Amino acid sequence: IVGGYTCAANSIPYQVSLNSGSHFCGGSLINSQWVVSAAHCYKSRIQVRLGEHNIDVLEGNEQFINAAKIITHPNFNGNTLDNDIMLIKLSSPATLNSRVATVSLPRSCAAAGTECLISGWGNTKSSGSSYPSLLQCLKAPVLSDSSCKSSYPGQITGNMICVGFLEGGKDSCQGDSGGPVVCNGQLQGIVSWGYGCAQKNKPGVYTKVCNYVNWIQQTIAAN
Amino acid sequence: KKVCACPKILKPVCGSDGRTYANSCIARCNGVSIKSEGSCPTGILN
Ligand SMILES: [Ca+2]
User: Fold this and answer.
1) A54: annotated binding-site residue?
2) CATH of A13-102+211-223 given 2.40.10.10, 3.90.180.10, 3.40.50.2300, 3.40.50.300
3) Which cofactor does it need (chain A)?
4) Which residues contact A146 (CB under 8 A, 6 or more apart)?
5) Which residues from chain A sit within 8 angstroms of residue B19, using beta carbons?
6) Distance (Å) from the C-alpha of residue B46 to the closest C-alpha of chain A?
7) What Cα–Cα distance (Å) separates residue A77 from each residue in B16, B26, B40?
8) Is A10 part of any known ligand binding site?
9) Fold adopted by A1-12+103-210
10) For residue A196, which residues of chain B lie inside 8 Å, CB to CB?
11) How far is CA A161 from the centre of its chain?
């Protein structure tokens, strides 16, 4: 997260870390045993870490649970990143308390201008590199469809929304993939891709969660 | 720079000379051939 601030301890209780040796993507806990992340974060073996704040130190609030089911959206296109969403069913339910909680799915899509909260343990620099121990947070508005499309001509699908600033400076970055974008207490986006990080006129592109509420629900009910 | 449209995943790769990239997409973006997967020591000087 470039241009963000260190989140307050357990201010983002639904944030999880996908680990396969080391942190590689983020995710969100939607219910005691299901995690939502980006389909491009797909790996055949995944360990989900919950209750994390500082990822380099065991603080005593952590829950490390292996993924049982790993389902990528049926229409995920690896080249265009369209339908970049994935569902993970934990092999055991997570224990909910103060540091571990669920995030709510959206009833409908967010309107442009809505302020959201993005978080992750990704790169905090747009030119160099620096990875934080502590979870980073960033407040950024959902951009209009026209602005998103003019920023990335011919690359924005109906399942993608731009969130961030056209002036650059603040944005999600490598290591934040699959993380949450929460607006009004609802998960509206999943960190997906972009032209570098925090570049002028190149806001981050995020998977539009509101288009997948029905799929998510059907999948959880059927598994 | 040589920045491109790439997914924001952190899956380091090693390249030429001794520089390691955030992920493969970033590597191919620059040009650097993926020598091996993972970061890399004396195959870069940071
Ligand atoms: Ca920790």
Assistant:
1) yes
2) 2.40.10.10
3) Ca(2+)
4) none
5) none
6) 10
7) 30, 19, 31
8) no
9) Thrombin, subunit H (2.40.10)
10) 1, 3-4, 6
11) 13
Residues found in chain A: 223
φ, ψ of residue A185 to 5 degrees: the values are: 65, 20
Q: Which method was used?
A: X-ray
Pair type for strands A15-19 and A34-37: unpaired
Give which of B1, B4, B10 to mutate to test A binding, by max A Cβ within 10 Å: B10
Closest residue in B to A82 (Cα–Cα): B7
Please tell me the class of the B1-46 domain.
Answer: alpha beta
Resolution value (Å, 1 decimal): 1.9
Out of A38, A152, A193, closest to residue B6 by CB: A193
As for chain A, the residues directly before each break of C–N over 2.5 Å are: none
Number of other residues whose CB lies within 10 A of the CB of residue A165: 20
